[PDB]
Design a protein around this ligand. Structure first.
Ligand code: 953
Length: 293
């Protein structure tokens, strides 16, 4: 028998781990001996497994399966249902949960050197993703998972796109989910996504880390304050595009080291070509960690 083939009927629900707009993740024990001794795994499934969604989810699964990196969650296998061929994605269970939750919980008990360890690890997962010509589109602490206090991994690829062979961006024609407060200006105006727009989002992740996920300071709270809390629906996108074009940016987080804030603002360059590379970010971050240690 083949360990990447999981039989649905042996997957026992233990608890719900997260829910997003089209999918959820559950903690399950894969327990074919039925004695509660089987492996605990994380299971992603669709809430509305329509034909169109299933096609996208099967691509997402092939994307994950193709990635093998210390800072990318490990694919374990898939569950197939009889008939309509519903799919479940089986992944390693990372027991400290999302980095967003983890940091919200421990706050400044996690110090700067540890935040920079996480930053370096995120940078390296992304740099590796870019070698495969994948654009994540949703890089945010809510999509990063914590294996243990010394290792984080990019943990979800639901918005991930594969670049066409002849172009350095992917244009999304009819967006669903759009985490606009993490989006580069060209992603807001033209729905164009690229390694450089993931770099813009990584700058937002760095902001998240350094604000310790304080709610009143989250990217949506701060951008809504800068455009005015009265803006709603499609007008938020309009005013956010105008704000970014005028160099309105998230503020320096309280207590943030200068050199870290410098990296965020360089990621938030309006000129796509001036944003740094993930290769360079990982070098720079590791130099900072070295200097600090
Ligand atoms: N939202 C969460 O808090 C959470 C927790 C996990 C998790 C926990 C432990 N191991 C693994 N693989 N995933 N994975 C998620 C998660 C869920 C979703 C969604 F939207 F699909 F449900 C998306 C992204 C993440 Cl990280």
């Amino acid at each position: 028998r083949d360990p990447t083939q999981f039989e649905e009927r042996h997957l026992k629900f233990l608890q719900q781990l997260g829910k997003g707009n089209f999918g959820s993740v559950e903690m399950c024990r894969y327990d074919p001996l039925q004695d509660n001794t089987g492996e605990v795994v994380a299971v992603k499934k669709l809430q509305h497994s329509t034909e169109e969604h299933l096609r996208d989810f099967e691509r997402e699964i092939e994307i994950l399966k193709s990635l093998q990196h210390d800072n990318i969650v490990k694919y374990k296998g898939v569950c197939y249902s009889a008939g309509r061929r519903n799919l479940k994605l089986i992944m390693e269970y990372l027991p400290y949960g999302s980095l967003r939750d983890y940091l919200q919980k421990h706050k400044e008990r996690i110090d700067h050197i540890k935040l920079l360890q996480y930053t370096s690890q995120i940078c390296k997962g992304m740099e590796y993703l870019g070698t495969k010509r994948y654009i994540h589109r949703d890089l945010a602490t809510r999509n990063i998972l914590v294996e243990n206090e010394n290792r984080v991994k990019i943990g979800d690829f639901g918005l991930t796109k594969v670049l066409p062979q002849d172009k350095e961006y992917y244009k999304v024609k009819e967006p669903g989910e759009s985490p606009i407060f993490w989006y580069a200006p060209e992603s807001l105006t033209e729905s164009k996504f690229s390694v450089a727009s993931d770099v813009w989002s990584f700058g937002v992740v760095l902001y998240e880390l350094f604000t310790y996920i304080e709610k009143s300071k989250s990217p949506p709270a701060e951008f809504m304050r800068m455009i005015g809390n009265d803006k709603q629906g499609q007008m938020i996108v309009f005013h956010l595009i105008e704000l970014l074009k005028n160099n309105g940016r998230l503020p320096r987080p309280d207590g943030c080291p200068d050199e870290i804030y410098m990296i965020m603002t360089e990621c938030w360059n309006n000129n796509v070509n001036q944003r740094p590379s993930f290769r360079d970010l990982a070098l720079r971050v590791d130099q900072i960690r070295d200097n600090m240690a």
